[PDB]
Amino acid sequence: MVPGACPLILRLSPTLHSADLIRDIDAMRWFLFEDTGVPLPEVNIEVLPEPTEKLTVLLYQEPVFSLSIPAQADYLLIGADASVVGDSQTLPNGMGQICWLTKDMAHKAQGFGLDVFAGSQRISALLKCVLLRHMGEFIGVQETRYLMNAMEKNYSELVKELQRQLPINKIAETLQRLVSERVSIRDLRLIFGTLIDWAPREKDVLMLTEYVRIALRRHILRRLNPEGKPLPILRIGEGIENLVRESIRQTAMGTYTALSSRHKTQILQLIEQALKQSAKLFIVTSVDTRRFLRKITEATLFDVPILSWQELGEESLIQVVESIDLSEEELADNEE
Amino acid sequence: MVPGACPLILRLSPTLHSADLIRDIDAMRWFLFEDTGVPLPEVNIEVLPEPTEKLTVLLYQEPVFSLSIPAQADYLLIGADASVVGDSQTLPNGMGQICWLTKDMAHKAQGFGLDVFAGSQRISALLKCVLLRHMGEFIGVQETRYLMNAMEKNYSELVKELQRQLPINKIAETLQRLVSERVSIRDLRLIFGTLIDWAPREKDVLMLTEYVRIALRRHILRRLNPEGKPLPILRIGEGIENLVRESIRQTAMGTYTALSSRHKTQILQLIEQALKQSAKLFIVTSVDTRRFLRKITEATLFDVPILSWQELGEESLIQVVESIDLSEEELADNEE
Amino acid sequence: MVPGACPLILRLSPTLHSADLIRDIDAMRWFLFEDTGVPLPEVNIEVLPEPTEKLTVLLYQEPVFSLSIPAQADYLLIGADASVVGDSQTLPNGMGQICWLTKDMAHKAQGFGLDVFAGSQRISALLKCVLLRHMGEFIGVQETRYLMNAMEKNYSELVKELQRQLPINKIAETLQRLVSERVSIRDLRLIFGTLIDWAPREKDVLMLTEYVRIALRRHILRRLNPEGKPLPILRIGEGIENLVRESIRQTAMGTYTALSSRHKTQILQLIEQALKQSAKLFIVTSVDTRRFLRKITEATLFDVPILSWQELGEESLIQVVESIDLSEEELADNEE
Amino acid sequence: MVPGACPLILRLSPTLHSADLIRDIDAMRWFLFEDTGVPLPEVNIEVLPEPTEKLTVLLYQEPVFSLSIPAQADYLLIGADASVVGDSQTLPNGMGQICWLTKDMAHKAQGFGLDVFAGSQRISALLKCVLLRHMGEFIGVQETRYLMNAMEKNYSELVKELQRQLPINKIAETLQRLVSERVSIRDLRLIFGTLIDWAPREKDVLMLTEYVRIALRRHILRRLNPEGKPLPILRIGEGIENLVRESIRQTAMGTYTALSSRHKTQILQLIEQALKQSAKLFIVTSVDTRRFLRKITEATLFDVPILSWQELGEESLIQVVESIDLSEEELADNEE
Amino acid sequence: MVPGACPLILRLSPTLHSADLIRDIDAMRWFLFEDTGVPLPEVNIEVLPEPTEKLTVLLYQEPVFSLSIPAQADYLLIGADASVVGDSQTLPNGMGQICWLTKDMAHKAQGFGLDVFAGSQRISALLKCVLLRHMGEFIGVQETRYLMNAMEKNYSELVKELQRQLPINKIAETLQRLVSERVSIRDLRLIFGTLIDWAPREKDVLMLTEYVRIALRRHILRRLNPEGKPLPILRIGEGIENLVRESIRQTAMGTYTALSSRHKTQILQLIEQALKQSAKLFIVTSVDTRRFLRKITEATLFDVPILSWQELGEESLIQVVESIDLSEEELADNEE
Amino acid sequence: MVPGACPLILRLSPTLHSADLIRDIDAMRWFLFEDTGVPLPEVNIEVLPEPTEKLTVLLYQEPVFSLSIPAQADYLLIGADASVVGDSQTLPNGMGQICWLTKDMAHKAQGFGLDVFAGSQRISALLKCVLLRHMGEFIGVQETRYLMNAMEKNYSELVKELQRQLPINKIAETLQRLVSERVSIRDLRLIFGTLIDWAPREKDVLMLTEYVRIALRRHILRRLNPEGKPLPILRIGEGIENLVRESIRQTAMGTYTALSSRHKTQILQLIEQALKQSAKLFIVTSVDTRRFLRKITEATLFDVPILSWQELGEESLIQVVESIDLSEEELADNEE
């Protein structure tokens, strides 16, 4: 009877099991650590006797993924596009779309310039997708302590100064709030430097996270679009900025937002209305209204990146696509 | 899985690789340490398989430099001038201009009295340029602790007194603010002496940095122009000095500037307007308005040196070239 | 990569190097320590390949002296006078004048009753001049700690009491302020005794330095003129004394002066006007106005000694040469 | 790279794996520990992708068992008899015979009064057979130390006295020599008591093992035949006893046997000749000739128990079946 | 200047380098450790600028392998056979034969049932061959101490007892003598158990190695031929056994052989004469004459396995192919 | 007054001095350490005022090299050959020949396929020659302790075992005897392993050195001729081998040779007679007579390598050039 759930378990029917699965999963874990900076725990391979070809992914013994992989498809392609269509289905929890492709069509799709997985890879490129959705769950107080112990080797004084500044729960909260936005915490030297700079002058951990995000703006704007080409930007007009800026209520532990449910519902409804025009859009708002806006759109629109103006330096051109704007709702619509 | 990004990585196609590259890079690193006083971390040479002749420079695993060196050019000359023209291109991030010269023309340019690099040197004189742009990133709390440990050998009491005066984060902030202006921190005895003098009488780390810059004025005015010949100086008129002096707002952690965005935009626009007349200009303003002016021109005009009046002693003649002046903008233009 | 600049470096071209240079430099260093009490660091002899006969003196790797010694002169005489003229030039940074003399004329000048250097000495009598200009740079917190450790051998209780009175940064500030005026700190017993006496009753380190200077008045008035003969004295009239006495503004760290730039400029202009009548003049003012006057004339007139009335006891006759006097400038000239 | 082979690995193809395999293997391990007293190491279940239904058992990563279980058989019965025949094959390394029985015939065989395994049990009753053949390999110096540490809880003085008597390598040798004969070492109190009694009076570890076997005679004669019914006994005549008794050669480490290869070959040939008359026979010889006889018949006839006369007390009746006897061979046959 | 040569260096020319080389080499190292039990040191990849496609393998900075891989071949097959012929050459130091195969012929050879390497693998399957020739050089006193420290985790008492028995140089000698015969030391529990058993009763480290080889006979006869099929055996007749048995001369450190050079030369000449009839032959001799025979055939015939009679149990059938026999040479030929 | 001479001093006239001399000497020192394994002490550059272009090399302040480099030669080539002739002279102490070549002829010689030095290199390629003659003087007890301390990092148990075997003076004697024969001690792992193997079984440090030389035979026969081509070998006939083998006289500290001076004189005279036929010859004798022969030819013929038969394995073909043979001298010539 060992307290504490088993972190990451992958249950497979013995048909799906293989001999190179261990090294493929390890390579995927190393790629995920190099990309997002969170050191994932070992994946425990377990055998699930089932006549149907089915796999499950269990996080802390609560099953978060359950998919039954049809026998007809032997080639896997994550996501959908116009060039490739056929035998596609929706992943649960809004993880996206997957396509099972026949051999020749999959070879054509790979020639088209995309990634296509075959064999044990079809498991990794599935499992990895799940791990990219519940990522913020693998960074707590204990994982933060492990990261700080790892950094104590070459950076002893940096870690000692940081501990002298902030208690470990606040550092873990900052790292978790950074991970849950697809911001890599791979560069821990810069993160600890920014926390050391702004720890005496700030106590709201949300604002410390904002400062760390600003200090990491080059990385964010590199990861969002690897090429230098301009990608679409959806501005937020002054109406919404003033609406969310006026409702800021502060207590001894920091500032939060206090809006009517009607305001949030209308803002999300119109943002989803403005998001169906193009596949990818970066919502851009002011610095003082960015985080609050995020925490009214994180529950539903988790995979849309909410950037800020200061995070886009003068060296990035905008190319506005749409300009969302509103007036209030409870007092008078005036826009809606 | 080792936390903490790898500091400095140079990825090369195997054609560009060589046998004397290690010692050439080490010589460049030693020159950079003798010049700017920042001890750089070891450059990790990695091989990048690519049909095109390409190299990348990665700082903390975020690629900051990526250049594809054409096969036709075998002679490299950093910068541009009227005497030499041909096969020149712009370095990214505004690092400057480079010229690829044929053998005979490069020999003529070397005879002209300039530096021309051939072989592994063409890598160093590229890499070094990058390292001269992101220099302020190699000096943090940990590197400051390493410098203080190095100085504990001959200067034990100086370092002990300095630690008794200031905490290590403030010393690291001072050294970083000095490095990010192309002021060498090679002379650590004088820097620690000035911090020991002015630490009890000052708490704004920006002002401590100003005092350290003033105590280093001979070095600054030697490095800006190695010869004693007078170089052009662009004065700042009393209008801008009074504009930025009136907007000084102080909090418990020190004083900052608070100007309208229109004021900053017009000041930078006219400074760039006044900078195209001659290649090099030293902007000179008052002591109380120098640092603030710098922090409204650091984002765009990083490579222009913002000197002060006290940094130019009575032994340096001025030779004013232009006298910039303004009145306000929001209240009334009156100059603009 | 060793932090901390190399203190004192002498770079010489092939021909000027010699075999007795080491012992000549060591003898000069010992003479400078016996004269001014500051223990100088070892001079590092380095070879500078140059077709022209040139030497450089580098303090903390920032070149402070650079002279190209013509081949025609083989006899060196520091300073100028009416009896000897020919092949003379101005040393940089206003260190003085030098004369290169032919063998017979140099023998005649030596017979005249002056010092003439030949061989390796021509280097020392040059280097020493430089070391007599930047002397105050070889006395900091660390050198003060070395002096106190040296004095802990015979004077243990004196040093212990002094440490109990003043922190090491204030002692180093006092010693530096004494060295930067050509006042020897060779007599450390008396200096520590005066600091022990006046430390409880005073907190302005400038005033502690004034008291130490007064307690050393016999040494000062011996070193200024080794013979008992009366040398010229330039009094400061009551107008300037009252002008600088009225502007004394005190803060928690001590008192400073606050004068208009016009006042300082006119005072220095007239002092230089009054200094061209005779080669050497001792400016004499009151005790309460002495140090402040010094800190308005140190930047330009570094080599003129600013004595005080209490430093000249009743046993030294004055022989006034000129009596400078003024009224204010901004309110009304009335003298200027 | 972890030194030391993985102790016990069971590799199974997709279809043979199950969900209750873990608890079935654990129950088999507990039964084996309760029966033979050797604490087995954890069985590591690994998946072996193979179209054919195959399993392998690996001891220290050297595969000792490899069996391909035909799809037609779903009911397993270990061993063979006249009542049940059909679909039977020989296990490798002479482990015995197995029968794959159809459902109805297996139910009839179970009704007959035998054990029949179905499902995951068909793996255990296979694996267990292997573990009953290489048992003596799971008891070394380290496992002996683990047993003694377990006994230090209730029997601290017994273990302390035993350690004071014999070094751990001799205790491990005794336990190994007892395990490799199908004598349980479950009763460690009695074994340690007998080693404590006879350790001062004996140094030949083989003779200590003989004394421990004699002190355990009740257990041996209970385990060989659980019921009190008389089972067949094959006596060894005085000729063989005198032949092996005369050849006893002793060195400082104890006594061994030295026989001609012809003698051993003829003895084994006739014993196998006398063993085909009945399925089970207990070979019984004198005390002084028992162990030596065992070590000339252990290589080939491993599973036949070589009892002694003193191990069969006066309360066990004999019922001799055959009386083997010989004269020598090299000198003269006289019997063979 | 770091004493101690760099263990394993692989130098490759520009084009042979790749991106998956690191993981391919690591997989080869892990396979070599799982096979032969010797933990190899990290392979250092270095770039060797060379117009010709060449690689070198350096053991302790003494180049042991140097091969220039022709551009025409892109498919590699280690060894030679009748089914595949074309573009084959001899590896240096008698490592074997290699074949460079065109794509279609290599696919046909892979279909034939052999291993064919392409890409970075062509390096590994080369490097690995070298590592299988100088294997006995990666096991010394220090590597033995590392193995014993690794075994101290689960087997603490086994290692402690072994250290109490034998000093570390003798254990390292035993492990080295086992590795230099292609006997895996992966099973360290059994090796340490056999050394603990036979350490008190033996002092000749060669005989301890013989006992450890006998205790590992199942592993040896499994690795020599993975299948149970009978492979050819070349017996050694009684003449050679008696010749080498008579010449055994013992000193305080153990027994060695003392034969005339003519005897050794004739024995090797006839063994090579008897080895050209079939590709693989296992030379089998008596126990008392096995090791000595090995140490007269190790210098020339390194890759032929010299088994013994006791290492082949009664369960392995022989299938003699030839029966070598001789009389002496110096006294009288009588056979040669 | 510091006891202990200054190890390595290079005195140069200031014309020969340069700016890159420090790094050129450091590169030469690193090459010498990589080649011969002896860590050389820092070269102290001193200036020697001399009208003539002269340099001296001082080992422990006893001048071992003194050369006056003529002004006419500006290109240096070490050694002589038929292809290049002109302005050549003999180095002192039989270090060899040097050639000063004019620019065009030196370029032709470099094109011929040799090494030609210009500038500061002309000093290194001189100094290095000296360091290759008195090499055995830079390895004593203290340098051996430094090497063992360096090896204590990765090889702690190897060094500890070696210290337990041999005292440091014997290890230093072995390393010195290996260095004074141009055998590299770069591979310290193998040397310490061989000393650990043969330390219990041998006490004559000369024989331990012989065993270490035999274990290093591959390195010796690689360094003597880098290519695999056969180089000439001068055998020593059985007469000399029997002469020096009969005179072996042993005392408690080992065996030495005791020959008549006539025997040694005749052997050296004829060896020099046999050495003028070809430039390079490897003298090859038996194992039991090798070292003794070396210690009768080390005083005069220092640079000729005295190999052995066991050092040339069966894989190196001989190509005898001459076969020297003698009978005794004092009893009767019979050959001489």
Numbering used by the authors:
A (entry chain Q), B (entry chain R), C (entry chain J), D (entry chain B), E (entry chain A), F (entry chain E): 346 to 681
Sentences from the paper on this structure:
Consistent with other reported SctVC structures, the SsaVC monomer also has a four-subdomain (SD) structure and further assembles to a nonameric ring aligned to SD3, which is the most conserved region of SsaVC.
Unlike InvAC, SsaVC could maintain a very stable high oligomeric state even in the high salt concentration analyzed by the size exclusion chromatography (SEC) and dynamic light scattering (DLS). Through a cryo-EM single particle analysis approach, we reconstructed and classified two conformations of SsaVC: one 3.55 Å cryo-EM structure with double stacked nonameric rings with D9 symmetry, and the other 3.64 Å cryo-EM structure with a single nonameric ring with C9 symmetry, the particle number of which are approximately comparable. The double-layer ring conformation of SsaVC is considered to be an artifact, consistent with a previous study.
